[PDB]
Design a protein around this nucleic acid. Structure first.
Ligand SMILES: [K+]
Ligand SMILES: [Mg+2]
Ligand SMILES: [Mg+2]
Ligand SMILES: [Mg+2]
Ligand SMILES: [Mg+2]
Ligand SMILES: [Mg+2]
Ligand SMILES: [Mg+2]
Ligand SMILES: [Mg+2]
Ligand SMILES: [Mg+2]
Ligand SMILES: [Mg+2]
Ligand SMILES: [Mg+2]
Ligand SMILES: [Mg+2]
Ligand SMILES: [Mg+2]
Ligand SMILES: [Mg+2]
Ligand SMILES: [Mg+2]
Ligand SMILES: [Mg+2]
Ligand SMILES: [Mg+2]
Ligand SMILES: [Mg+2]
Ligand SMILES: [Mg+2]
Ligand SMILES: [Mg+2]
Ligand SMILES: [Mg+2]
Ligand SMILES: [Mg+2]
Ligand SMILES: [Mg+2]
Ligand SMILES: [Mg+2]
Ligand SMILES: [Mg+2]
Ligand SMILES: [Mg+2]
Ligand SMILES: [Mg+2]
Ligand SMILES: [Mg+2]
Ligand SMILES: [Mg+2]
Ligand SMILES: [Mg+2]
Ligand SMILES: [Mg+2]
Ligand SMILES: [Mg+2]
Ligand SMILES: [Mg+2]
Ligand SMILES: [Mg+2]
Ligand SMILES: [Mg+2]
Ligand SMILES: [Mg+2]
Ligand SMILES: [Mg+2]
Ligand SMILES: [Mg+2]
Ligand SMILES: [Mg+2]
Ligand SMILES: [Mg+2]
Ligand SMILES: [Mg+2]
Ligand SMILES: [Mg+2]
Ligand SMILES: [Mg+2]
Ligand SMILES: [Mg+2]
Ligand SMILES: [Mg+2]
Ligand SMILES: [Mg+2]
Ligand SMILES: [Mg+2]
Ligand SMILES: [Mg+2]
Ligand SMILES: [Mg+2]
Ligand SMILES: [Mg+2]
Ligand SMILES: [Mg+2]
Ligand SMILES: [Mg+2]
Ligand SMILES: [Mg+2]
Ligand SMILES: [Mg+2]
Ligand SMILES: [Mg+2]
Ligand SMILES: [Mg+2]
Ligand SMILES: [Mg+2]
Ligand SMILES: [Mg+2]
Ligand SMILES: [Mg+2]
Ligand SMILES: [Mg+2]
Ligand SMILES: [Mg+2]
Ligand SMILES: [Mg+2]
Ligand SMILES: [Mg+2]
Ligand SMILES: [Mg+2]
Ligand SMILES: [Mg+2]
Ligand SMILES: [Mg+2]
Ligand SMILES: [Mg+2]
Ligand SMILES: [Mg+2]
Ligand SMILES: [Mg+2]
Ligand SMILES: [Mg+2]
Ligand SMILES: [Mg+2]
Ligand SMILES: [Mg+2]
Ligand SMILES: [Mg+2]
Ligand SMILES: [Mg+2]
Ligand SMILES: [Mg+2]
Ligand SMILES: [Mg+2]
Ligand SMILES: [Mg+2]
Ligand SMILES: [Mg+2]
Ligand SMILES: [Mg+2]
Ligand SMILES: [Mg+2]
Ligand SMILES: [Mg+2]
Ligand SMILES: [Mg+2]
Ligand SMILES: [Mg+2]
Ligand SMILES: [Mg+2]
Ligand SMILES: [Mg+2]
Ligand SMILES: [Mg+2]
Ligand SMILES: [Mg+2]
Ligand SMILES: [Mg+2]
Ligand SMILES: [Mg+2]
Ligand SMILES: [Mg+2]
Ligand SMILES: [Mg+2]
Ligand SMILES: [Mg+2]
Ligand SMILES: [Mg+2]
Ligand SMILES: [Mg+2]
Ligand SMILES: [Mg+2]
Ligand SMILES: [Mg+2]
Ligand SMILES: [Mg+2]
Ligand SMILES: [Mg+2]
Ligand SMILES: [Mg+2]
Ligand SMILES: [Mg+2]
Ligand SMILES: [Mg+2]
Ligand SMILES: [Mg+2]
Ligand SMILES: [Mg+2]
Ligand SMILES: [Mg+2]
Ligand SMILES: [Mg+2]
Ligand SMILES: [Mg+2]
Ligand SMILES: [Mg+2]
Ligand SMILES: [Mg+2]
Ligand SMILES: [Mg+2]
Ligand SMILES: [Mg+2]
Ligand SMILES: [Mg+2]
Ligand SMILES: [Mg+2]
Ligand SMILES: [Mg+2]
Ligand SMILES: [Mg+2]
Ligand SMILES: [Mg+2]
Ligand SMILES: [Mg+2]
Ligand SMILES: [Mg+2]
Ligand SMILES: [Mg+2]
Ligand SMILES: [Mg+2]
Ligand SMILES: [Mg+2]
Ligand SMILES: [Mg+2]
Ligand SMILES: [Mg+2]
Ligand SMILES: [Mg+2]
Ligand SMILES: [Mg+2]
Ligand SMILES: [Mg+2]
Ligand SMILES: [Mg+2]
Ligand SMILES: [Mg+2]
Ligand SMILES: [Mg+2]
Ligand SMILES: [Mg+2]
Ligand SMILES: [Mg+2]
Ligand SMILES: [Mg+2]
Ligand SMILES: [Mg+2]
Ligand SMILES: [Mg+2]
Ligand SMILES: [Mg+2]
Ligand SMILES: [Mg+2]
Ligand SMILES: [Mg+2]
Ligand SMILES: [Mg+2]
Ligand SMILES: [Mg+2]
Ligand SMILES: [Mg+2]
Ligand SMILES: [Mg+2]
Ligand SMILES: [Mg+2]
Ligand SMILES: [Mg+2]
Ligand SMILES: [Mg+2]
Ligand SMILES: [Mg+2]
Ligand SMILES: [Mg+2]
Ligand SMILES: [Mg+2]
Ligand SMILES: [Mg+2]
Ligand SMILES: [Mg+2]
Ligand SMILES: [Mg+2]
Ligand SMILES: [Mg+2]
Ligand SMILES: [Mg+2]
Ligand SMILES: [Mg+2]
Ligand SMILES: [Mg+2]
Ligand SMILES: [Mg+2]
Ligand SMILES: [Mg+2]
Ligand SMILES: [Mg+2]
Ligand SMILES: [Mg+2]
Ligand SMILES: [Mg+2]
Ligand SMILES: [Mg+2]
Ligand SMILES: [Mg+2]
Ligand SMILES: [Mg+2]
Ligand SMILES: [Mg+2]
Ligand SMILES: [Mg+2]
Ligand SMILES: [Mg+2]
Ligand SMILES: [Mg+2]
Ligand SMILES: [Mg+2]
Ligand SMILES: [Mg+2]
Ligand SMILES: [Mg+2]
Ligand SMILES: [Mg+2]
Ligand SMILES: [Mg+2]
Ligand SMILES: [Mg+2]
Ligand SMILES: [Mg+2]
Ligand SMILES: [Mg+2]
Ligand SMILES: [Mg+2]
Ligand SMILES: [Mg+2]
Ligand SMILES: [Mg+2]
Ligand SMILES: [Mg+2]
Ligand SMILES: [Mg+2]
Ligand SMILES: [Mg+2]
Ligand SMILES: [Mg+2]
Ligand SMILES: [Mg+2]
Ligand SMILES: [Mg+2]
Ligand SMILES: [Mg+2]
Ligand SMILES: [Mg+2]
Ligand SMILES: [Mg+2]
Ligand SMILES: [Mg+2]
Ligand SMILES: [Mg+2]
Ligand SMILES: [Mg+2]
Ligand SMILES: [Mg+2]
Ligand SMILES: [Mg+2]
Ligand SMILES: [Mg+2]
Ligand SMILES: [Mg+2]
Ligand SMILES: [Mg+2]
Ligand SMILES: [Mg+2]
Ligand SMILES: [Mg+2]
Ligand SMILES: [Mg+2]
Ligand SMILES: [Mg+2]
Ligand SMILES: [Mg+2]
Ligand SMILES: [Mg+2]
Ligand SMILES: [Mg+2]
Ligand SMILES: [Mg+2]
Ligand SMILES: [Mg+2]
Ligand SMILES: [Mg+2]
Ligand SMILES: [Mg+2]
Ligand SMILES: [Mg+2]
Ligand SMILES: [Mg+2]
Ligand SMILES: [Mg+2]
Ligand SMILES: [Mg+2]
Ligand SMILES: [Mg+2]
Ligand SMILES: [Mg+2]
Ligand SMILES: [Mg+2]
Ligand SMILES: [Mg+2]
Ligand SMILES: [Mg+2]
Ligand SMILES: [Mg+2]
Ligand SMILES: [Mg+2]
Ligand SMILES: [Mg+2]
Ligand SMILES: [Mg+2]
Ligand SMILES: [Mg+2]
Ligand SMILES: [Mg+2]
Ligand SMILES: [Mg+2]
Ligand SMILES: [Mg+2]
Ligand SMILES: [Mg+2]
Ligand SMILES: [Mg+2]
Ligand SMILES: [Mg+2]
Ligand SMILES: [Mg+2]
Ligand SMILES: [Mg+2]
Ligand SMILES: [Mg+2]
Ligand SMILES: [Mg+2]
Ligand SMILES: [Mg+2]
Ligand SMILES: [Mg+2]
Ligand SMILES: [Mg+2]
Ligand SMILES: [Mg+2]
Ligand SMILES: [Mg+2]
Lengths: 48, 275
RNA sequence: UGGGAGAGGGUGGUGGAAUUCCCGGAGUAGCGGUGAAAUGCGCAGAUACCGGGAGGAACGCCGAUGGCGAAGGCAGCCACCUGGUCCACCCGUGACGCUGAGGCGCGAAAGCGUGGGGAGCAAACCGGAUUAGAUACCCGGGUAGUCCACGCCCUAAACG
RNA sequence: CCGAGGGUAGGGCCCGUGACUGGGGCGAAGUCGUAACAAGGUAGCUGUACCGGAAGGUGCGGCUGGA
RNA sequence: GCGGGGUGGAGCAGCCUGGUAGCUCGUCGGGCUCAUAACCCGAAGGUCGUCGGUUCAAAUCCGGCCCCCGCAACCA
RNA sequence: GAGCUAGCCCUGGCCAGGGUGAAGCUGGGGUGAGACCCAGUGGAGGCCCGAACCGGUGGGGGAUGCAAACCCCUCGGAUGA
RNA sequence: GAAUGCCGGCAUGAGUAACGAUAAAGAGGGUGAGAAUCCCUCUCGCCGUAAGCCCAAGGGUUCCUACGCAAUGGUCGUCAGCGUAGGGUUAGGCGGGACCUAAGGUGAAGCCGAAAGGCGUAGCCGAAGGGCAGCCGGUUAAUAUUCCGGCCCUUCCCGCAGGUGCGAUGGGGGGACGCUCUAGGCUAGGGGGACCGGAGCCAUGGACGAGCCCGGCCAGAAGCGCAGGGUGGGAGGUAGGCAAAUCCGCCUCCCAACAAGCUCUGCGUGGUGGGGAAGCCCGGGUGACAACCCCCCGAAGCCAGGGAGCCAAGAAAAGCCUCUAAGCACAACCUGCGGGAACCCGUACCGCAAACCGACACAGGUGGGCGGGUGCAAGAGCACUCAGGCGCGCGGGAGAACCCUCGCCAAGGAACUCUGCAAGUUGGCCCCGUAACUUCGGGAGAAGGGGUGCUCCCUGGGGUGAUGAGCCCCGGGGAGCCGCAGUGAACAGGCUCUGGCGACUGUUUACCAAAAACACAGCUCUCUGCGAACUCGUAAGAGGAGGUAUAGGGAGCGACGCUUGCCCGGUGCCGGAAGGUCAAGGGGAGGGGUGCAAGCCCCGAACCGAAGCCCCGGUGAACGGCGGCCGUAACUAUAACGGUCCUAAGGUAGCGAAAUUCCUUGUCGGGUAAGUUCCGACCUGCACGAAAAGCGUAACGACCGGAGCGCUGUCUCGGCGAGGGACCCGGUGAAAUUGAACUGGCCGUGAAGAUGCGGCCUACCCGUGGCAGGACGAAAAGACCCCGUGGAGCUUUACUGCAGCC
RNA sequence: CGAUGUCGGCUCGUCGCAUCCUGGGGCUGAAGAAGGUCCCAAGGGUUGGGCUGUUCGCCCAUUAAAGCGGCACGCGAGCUG
């Protein structure tokens, strides 16, 4: 049947993207945390 | 009048539509229409704030002239009478001798080719706009400003009217469509005659789908819900109210008066409404 | 051809009396109602009186034993549209007449549908009395309805 | 081929009968009231509507075969 | 299983707060009427479901027995 | 977190074929004029039958499955809310 | 040594289940260490509104070639979407950007919020919508509207010529619109040809034929032809389109108006350039100087901004045209010609799937376009089949039980069962015919019947043409032939009578309920006078609504019909400038502390003092509620009637053993041989009843009852047959479970149901196919029940707060 | 209670005997036939339907008879639901 993951490059970049994170207080804290942990990627990969 | 149908489907049995007798133009004036923004009953937060709305036919908004003292002394000819999907009343097209073109709501008995005018000096003829104080007591009137120059706010619905009952100082007394007796300022404009398309209330939608065309989504009873949703929710099998009938938000809905008591306009309402 | 009387019919308008309600004023101990009373209304200011406003319905005197219409029926006043009818004149047509099973139309009230309207009145209904009882007569309330528009119903002591 | 008629399917009219039900007629001395005939004790009758154990009552209009 | 009841012939007061049984109808005698009803004047009739106790005293307060209506009997 | 799902907003797209035959219009009859009747024309509809499409009624299978909801037979809607 | 402990390792079940659609395989040749599995050939089967082809998401080198086979591939592997390496994606015209706006997002001005932030007109962003210039062939192992060839085109810059009042982010026009139906003319596509081109072919009885088989076009500027779209011309006035305006709008006047003209598209033709089959030789070459013609069918596509009807009344903005404003008129713009200039990103390959979403090379899910032919009434349905693509990545045998999917069945025909569940039956089209009832539509496909193939003859109407021939499409009337049977295969209703419920089409518990539930038109009550009520928000601001009482919110009821009675004492809501109580505050009789005092400080009664409550009314389609006992009629029985207690008032109409009735399978009637169900009645209604509506109701229903006909493997009662498994052999090889085990019956015993204890009986050791009685078998720390001063959702006249409102 | 699936049907039986039938007896208010009642006897037999989920029961048509109980109200790693 139809499952829950339905990949969409525009959807992905607009929702979890770097610029969407940077605009919001909670989003900036996300970036701050993933940088603190040493995450190699701060943001989901997407070919745009 | 009202058009019936033969019962050739279960719904055509009761469905009635307008005769559209008085309509003379089938498409609007391009310069006078702007796009209507459908809300679905959602405010700027995007929350439903008026329930059960959305999904109706697309409409264009016809810009209506509710001032009219805009162009005092400049007569206009009635070019056409048109369908307006944004209101119950029909609308009439005015070509002013100015060359300006405007929409007003069409009063009853208004006829295409006739002449209408607005101003203190205007003739008491259906389709003419005057400040209230210059209109003879007793004549029926519509599109009434509530306050000077603020726009026609009263009696715009199909078939409605207000009647002038008398005067007091800078104020006249109107009997509104509701039967309320109210003081409205003398310099408030109004159009003489009543709004047309009085047969509008005789319309039987006929099937669920017609409500759906009008953008009205199905209304689900409080009694059909669960306690988390509504005071009338829950109960094993059907239940009576079991409390004074209430809204989803819990306030009483059978007789609880709701107009603010200390309202400034209370000084101007003589007698609360009719039936 | 010329004339006459009339609440004949339809439409639109319009006048004053009365009732009810509302607002103001003045004023206080009851009003109302009956056979007698009670219910009811009234010191939260009623009734009675004066001014103001709204609304509906019916048209006093003229008015008659009168008039008109085929009947049912039609009554303030004005205008418009329309029916019947009588008289005169002795002008025209030349029996073109009478009646009429069917059909068609009209048809008081009550009643019914949709929409208005709603003062007074008032089935149902409530209450107060009477009464052995009183699902009545009498009294105080009161909803349809009575009024308007459109469409039904098609009845009668529709009787001379 | 037609064909008595047999058979299948569906209709129409009539007749008898049916738990129960509806009023009607009748029936020497039942119960409740007293509607009508005298102004019958609220004049009656009436078409219609609503109501009531019952006759009836009331509304609206009509008739006199009442005053 | 828990609650309220039993009192002239019928339907109900009085019990709670111990002493003293009352109301409407019915019934009996008398009146009015030609007569009956209605109406009017008078009267009779309970010994309080029973037994047991508390008390100077029990319709009444307390207990059992007899009956009369009622509410209840749920989880599977 | 509304890339599932629920509702709404904007902009696009899709619905084989067949069937039934409303209003209207035309002609005719009818009448004082009407209502109205008849035929043709017409092509309405949360109309009918049925693919795509959207479903998920009954049964059977499957049940460490092909699948953490599937498969077969049947069945609902299919110009509309 | 235990914690259903934690991490790891290794066992058991076990050579067991399985190896992923039952579309299917066989042989020959080749490669190689090795071949059912790779390559080639032939033969067979499968899809063909796809299982073929193109595009878009998404994926990201998976593409092509060489060399490989440890692992990945459910087996094998020499093969591969796998390993290593090399190569491969070419644009002014295709898509997106250097253009436009939609929702929405953002946001100069401005508003609001403790902070973070929320909002917000313009403007900006935002596309699969608007706008815009490329078609055909060739070429590579792999790219192509991109490279190449032919023929076309766009914008920008500069120049020359001509022309003009040039000039815009401003004005105006246009862009610019729905649904259903649909005309004319074309094209895409397709069928036929006795015509044209073509290798060949004559078989096995016949045919050297008007035989068979193959093919018969594509693109194309200007001009031209056909079909359509768009569009009036002139003049005068002018105050309107926030400046101006000759434009647009409005008024007047002359001319022409299904025309014409001007214009713009489509199709046709068109210089030119391409392509070009079968077959036969080795993707290629030949065919071949290939031919490239006529007739018919014909779109849902094109002309398109076409037309008609309808109501629910159907984006915006730029490109573009016109008007003018500063400006500037040696400029500028328009037109024609010329030269120059023209950037960034994508482009491989998969793409209904083995490369996307599903942990898998997973029977599931995934938007758009093309989708051939014949026949069956039509069609994207069904069967076959073209092009193209496949046989689904374990096989070989055997021919048990049993399981699944399937076929048939004597006599009977629902006797099966909770139930005809399931499976039969019926089944398309044409014709005849079709009941109660009804809201006149319907009920209707009612029911029930007849016809259906092929051949010959006669004939009627239409389309295209030409009015004829031909081809094509509707038909009608004779006469015949064959079979068991002519919608001969496949696709394709069983029907009826009668109840309950819901009017209806719809909607729902994704993944155990589709229903009588929700919704629904419709009815009523109620609130709301607009800065509305109401809703979201601390607010600003929004929705309501650019609406205005014929409107908007809330509630109940639920098409329609006939109806909806009585109670206002309690609660609710509404009305009530009296009275009563009532907080802060006002008031300050009167005390108190301190000080030597002036003073400072403190308490403080009467009385004035809102809403709310009390109190007086109203109010039922507001919350709700609508009695008991005793007696009475000339047979009995019953009680129209009466008595009395209580109530705020005692249930009206209509219904009733009911989706409601306990007693209960009530009783009577119907149907049956027999009826706890069903239908019709009765009425002591345990415990119906009037908008939590009452009683009916045509039509509708994958709803739930009862019955009959039809027909059946449901059954009496089973039998046989088919394939996929089960079985056997080669290959690969799990699982939950498992204290250890050397794990028998009876009667006892035992924590009360013993393989394990006692006594007795029985029993050589080990497997395989089977069946399920036991191992209180497995699975899940019972979801019932209780316990915990455990938790959560929900209610209220529980408590106590808070929002909100007064 | 770190689970012993719970009615009825179906399928499959097996056992008890307080025996429904069949066989053998005594007593009889046993004439015969047919019954009544008790004793012995478990080898075999013990039907098909209507109604209801039903077990049971009633009913229809039969029959030699239409037994009653146990087996976790026998039997859901056997089916139904
Ligand atoms: K329970
Ligand atoms: Mg998916
Ligand atoms: Mg995307
Ligand atoms: Mg996208
Ligand atoms: Mg997106
Ligand atoms: Mg982002
Ligand atoms: Mg790094
Ligand atoms: Mg992140
Ligand atoms: Mg209608
Ligand atoms: Mg119609
Ligand atoms: Mg109308
Ligand atoms: Mg109109
Ligand atoms: Mg515009
Ligand atoms: Mg917003
Ligand atoms: Mg937001
Ligand atoms: Mg709302
Ligand atoms: Mg809404
Ligand atoms: Mg309108
Ligand atoms: Mg105003
Ligand atoms: Mg005012
Ligand atoms: Mg109207
Ligand atoms: Mg609703
Ligand atoms: Mg519910
Ligand atoms: Mg919630
Ligand atoms: Mg609540
Ligand atoms: Mg409730
Ligand atoms: Mg409920
Ligand atoms: Mg209930
Ligand atoms: Mg008011
Ligand atoms: Mg006073
Ligand atoms: Mg003469
Ligand atoms: Mg006559
Ligand atoms: Mg009449
Ligand atoms: Mg009348
Ligand atoms: Mg008397
Ligand atoms: Mg008379
Ligand atoms: Mg015969
Ligand atoms: Mg009398
Ligand atoms: Mg009388
Ligand atoms: Mg009398
Ligand atoms: Mg009389
Ligand atoms: Mg009575
Ligand atoms: Mg009366
Ligand atoms: Mg007389
Ligand atoms: Mg007492
Ligand atoms: Mg005598
Ligand atoms: Mg006496
Ligand atoms: Mg003593
Ligand atoms: Mg004693
Ligand atoms: Mg005593
Ligand atoms: Mg004593
Ligand atoms: Mg005492
Ligand atoms: Mg009880
Ligand atoms: Mg409970
Ligand atoms: Mg239980
Ligand atoms: Mg979504
Ligand atoms: Mg999404
Ligand atoms: Mg669309
Ligand atoms: Mg469709
Ligand atoms: Mg069709
Ligand atoms: Mg026709
Ligand atoms: Mg149609
Ligand atoms: Mg349909
Ligand atoms: Mg689905
Ligand atoms: Mg299904
Ligand atoms: Mg089935
Ligand atoms: Mg199964
Ligand atoms: Mg499952
Ligand atoms: Mg399936
Ligand atoms: Mg269908
Ligand atoms: Mg269709
Ligand atoms: Mg739609
Ligand atoms: Mg230990
Ligand atoms: Mg474990
Ligand atoms: Mg642990
Ligand atoms: Mg192992
Ligand atoms: Mg095993
Ligand atoms: Mg397995
Ligand atoms: Mg498998
Ligand atoms: Mg072979
Ligand atoms: Mg191999
Ligand atoms: Mg090998
Ligand atoms: Mg293979
Ligand atoms: Mg090969
Ligand atoms: Mg095909
Ligand atoms: Mg991937
Ligand atoms: Mg390998
Ligand atoms: Mg290998
Ligand atoms: Mg190897
Ligand atoms: Mg290697
Ligand atoms: Mg492997
Ligand atoms: Mg391998
Ligand atoms: Mg695999
Ligand atoms: Mg090799
Ligand atoms: Mg490549
Ligand atoms: Mg190029
Ligand atoms: Mg540039
Ligand atoms: Mg842009
Ligand atoms: Mg932009
Ligand atoms: Mg954006
Ligand atoms: Mg943009
Ligand atoms: Mg775009
Ligand atoms: Mg482009
Ligand atoms: Mg081109
Ligand atoms: Mg210019
Ligand atoms: Mg527009
Ligand atoms: Mg558009
Ligand atoms: Mg339409
Ligand atoms: Mg055409
Ligand atoms: Mg072409
Ligand atoms: Mg063809
Ligand atoms: Mg040749
Ligand atoms: Mg001007
Ligand atoms: Mg200007
Ligand atoms: Mg050559
Ligand atoms: Mg815009
Ligand atoms: Mg200048
Ligand atoms: Mg110069
Ligand atoms: Mg020019
Ligand atoms: Mg650049
Ligand atoms: Mg490419
Ligand atoms: Mg696709
Ligand atoms: Mg593919
Ligand atoms: Mg693939
Ligand atoms: Mg993958
Ligand atoms: Mg996942
Ligand atoms: Mg595979
Ligand atoms: Mg797959
Ligand atoms: Mg067909
Ligand atoms: Mg295969
Ligand atoms: Mg396979
Ligand atoms: Mg095998
Ligand atoms: Mg074998
Ligand atoms: Mg088979
Ligand atoms: Mg058979
Ligand atoms: Mg049968
Ligand atoms: Mg049979
Ligand atoms: Mg049966
Ligand atoms: Mg059944
Ligand atoms: Mg069949
Ligand atoms: Mg068939
Ligand atoms: Mg009919
Ligand atoms: Mg048939
Ligand atoms: Mg043949
Ligand atoms: Mg069918
Ligand atoms: Mg029933
Ligand atoms: Mg339902
Ligand atoms: Mg339904
Ligand atoms: Mg119903
Ligand atoms: Mg109904
Ligand atoms: Mg309904
Ligand atoms: Mg579900
Ligand atoms: Mg669920
Ligand atoms: Mg299911
Ligand atoms: Mg359904
Ligand atoms: Mg409904
Ligand atoms: Mg209704
Ligand atoms: Mg809020
Ligand atoms: Mg707005
Ligand atoms: Mg509004
Ligand atoms: Mg509902
Ligand atoms: Mg309801
Ligand atoms: Mg009816
Ligand atoms: Mg009350
Ligand atoms: Mg009250
Ligand atoms: Mg009250
Ligand atoms: Mg105080
Ligand atoms: Mg107060
Ligand atoms: Mg008696
Ligand atoms: Mg009751
Ligand atoms: Mg009553
Ligand atoms: Mg019963
Ligand atoms: Mg009953
Ligand atoms: Mg029964
Ligand atoms: Mg009941
Ligand atoms: Mg029972
Ligand atoms: Mg029975
Ligand atoms: Mg019977
Ligand atoms: Mg019955
Ligand atoms: Mg009874
Ligand atoms: Mg209720
Ligand atoms: Mg109610
Ligand atoms: Mg029906
Ligand atoms: Mg249904
Ligand atoms: Mg349905
Ligand atoms: Mg259904
Ligand atoms: Mg069988
Ligand atoms: Mg086999
Ligand atoms: Mg297997
Ligand atoms: Mg392996
Ligand atoms: Mg394991
Ligand atoms: Mg051992
Ligand atoms: Mg051993
Ligand atoms: Mg024991
Ligand atoms: Mg034992
Ligand atoms: Mg042992
Ligand atoms: Mg042991
Ligand atoms: Mg021992
Ligand atoms: Mg032993
Ligand atoms: Mg033994
Ligand atoms: Mg076992
Ligand atoms: Mg087994
Ligand atoms: Mg076991
Ligand atoms: Mg489990
Ligand atoms: Mg635990
Ligand atoms: Mg536990
Ligand atoms: Mg558990
Ligand atoms: Mg327990
Ligand atoms: Mg506690
Ligand atoms: Mg404790
Ligand atoms: Mg707790
Ligand atoms: Mg919580
Ligand atoms: Mg409020
Ligand atoms: Mg347990
Ligand atoms: Mg365990
Ligand atoms: Mg367990
Ligand atoms: Mg014997
Ligand atoms: Mg014997
Ligand atoms: Mg014997
Ligand atoms: Mg035996
Ligand atoms: Mg035995
Ligand atoms: Mg039974
Ligand atoms: Mg029983
Ligand atoms: Mg026998
Ligand atoms: Mg015997
Ligand atoms: Mg068991
Ligand atoms: Mg037991
Ligand atoms: Mg058992
Ligand atoms: Mg069992
Ligand atoms: Mg089971
Ligand atoms: Mg069982
Ligand atoms: Mg088990
Ligand atoms: Mg077991």
């Amino acid at each position: 049947m139809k499952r829950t993951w339905q990949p969409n490059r525009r959807k992905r970049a607009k929702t979890h993207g770097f610029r969407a994170r940077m605009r919001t207080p909670g989003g900036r804290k996300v970036l701050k945390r993933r940088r603190q942990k040493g995450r190699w990627r701060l943001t989901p990969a997407v070919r745009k | 009048a009202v058009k019936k149908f033969k019962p050739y489907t279960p719904s055509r049995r009761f469905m009635t539509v307008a005769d559209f007798s008085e309509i003379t133009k089938t498409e609007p004036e391009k310069s006078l229409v702007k796009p209507l923004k459908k809300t679905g009953g959602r405010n700027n937060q995007g929350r439903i704030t008026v329930r059960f709305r959305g999904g109706g036919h697309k409409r264009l908004y016809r810009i209506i002239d509710f001032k009219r003292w805009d162009k005092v002394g400049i007569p206009a000819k009635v070019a056409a009478i048109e369908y307006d999907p944004n209101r119950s009343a029909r609308i009439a097209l005015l070509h002013y001798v100015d060359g300006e073109k405007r929409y007003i709501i069409a009063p009853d008995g208004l006829q295409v080719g006739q002449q209408v005018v607005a101003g203190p000096d205007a003739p008491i003829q259906v389709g003419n706009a005057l400040p209230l104080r210059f209109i003879p007591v007793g004549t029926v009137v519509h599109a009434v400003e509530l306050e000077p120059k603020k726009g026609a706010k009263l009696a715009r619905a199909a078939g409605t009217s207000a009647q002038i009952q008398g005067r007091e100082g800078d104020y006249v007394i109107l009997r509104l469509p509701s039967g309320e007796l109210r003081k409205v300022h003398g310099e408030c404009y109004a159009t003489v005659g009543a709004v047309g398309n009085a047969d509008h209330k005789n319309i039987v939608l006929g099937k669920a789908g017609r409500s759906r065309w009008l953008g009205r989504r199905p209304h689900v009873r409080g009694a059909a819900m669960n306690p988390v949703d509504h005071p009338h929710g829950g109960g094993e099998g059907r239940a009576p109210r079991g409390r004074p009938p209430a809204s989803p938000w819990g306030w009483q809905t059978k007789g609880l008066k709701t107009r603010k008591r200390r309202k400034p306009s209370s000084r101007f309402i003589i007698a609360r409404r009719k039936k």
